[PDB]
Amino acid sequence: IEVIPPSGQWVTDLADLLTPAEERMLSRKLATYADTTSTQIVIVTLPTLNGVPAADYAVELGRRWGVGQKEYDNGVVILVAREEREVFIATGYGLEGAIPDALAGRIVRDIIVPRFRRGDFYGGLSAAVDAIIAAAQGEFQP
Numbered sequence: 001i002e003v004i005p006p007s008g009q010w011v012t013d014l015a016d017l018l019t020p021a022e023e024r025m026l027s028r029k030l031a032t033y034a035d036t037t038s039t040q041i042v043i044v045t046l047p048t049l050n051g052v053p054a055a056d057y058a059v060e061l062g063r064r065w066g067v068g069q070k071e072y073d074n075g076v077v078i079l080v081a082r083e084e085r086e087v088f089i090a091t092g093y094g095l096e097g098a099i100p101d102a103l104a105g106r107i108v109r110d111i112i113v114p115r116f117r118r119g120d121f122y123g124g125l126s127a128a129v130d131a132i133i134a135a136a137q138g139e140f141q142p
């Protein structure tokens with residue numbers, strides 16, 4: 001599997017879902033969380049996965065980019081595959097148990113997808129970040 005190379009960005013919006021101001025606001029939140037906790041959460045948006053499963057892509061991007069390694073200790077990839085209408089939340093092994101499949105799925109189904117169907121990409125991703133941070137803190141309360 002070949003994924004995109006490391007961007008150096010908290011938000012890599014290759015589907016161009018977000019305005020620059022929306023990217024900068026998400027990026028500030030993500031960077032601040034990483035600074036305080038050493039947990040690196042990144043957002044990647046892609047026009048298409050070209051037939052690669054979202055799970056496989058998210059895991060390879062976390063590996064290739066070293067998400068949650070190097071300067072950081074734990075990692076999350078939020079991968080948005082626009083053509084396939086998939087959102088895959090991938091956590092590093094360190095965070096095993098913090099976001100089970102049902103909690104990730106409920107973030108996608110109930111938090112992200114209804115916002116995305118209205119064109120509210122910033123709100124859906126912002127709320128997903130907040131839910132991920134709450135879950136990583138042991139404080140997610142659906």
Ligand SMILES: [Mg+2]
Pocket residue numbers: 013016017018019020023
């Ligand atoms: Mg953009």
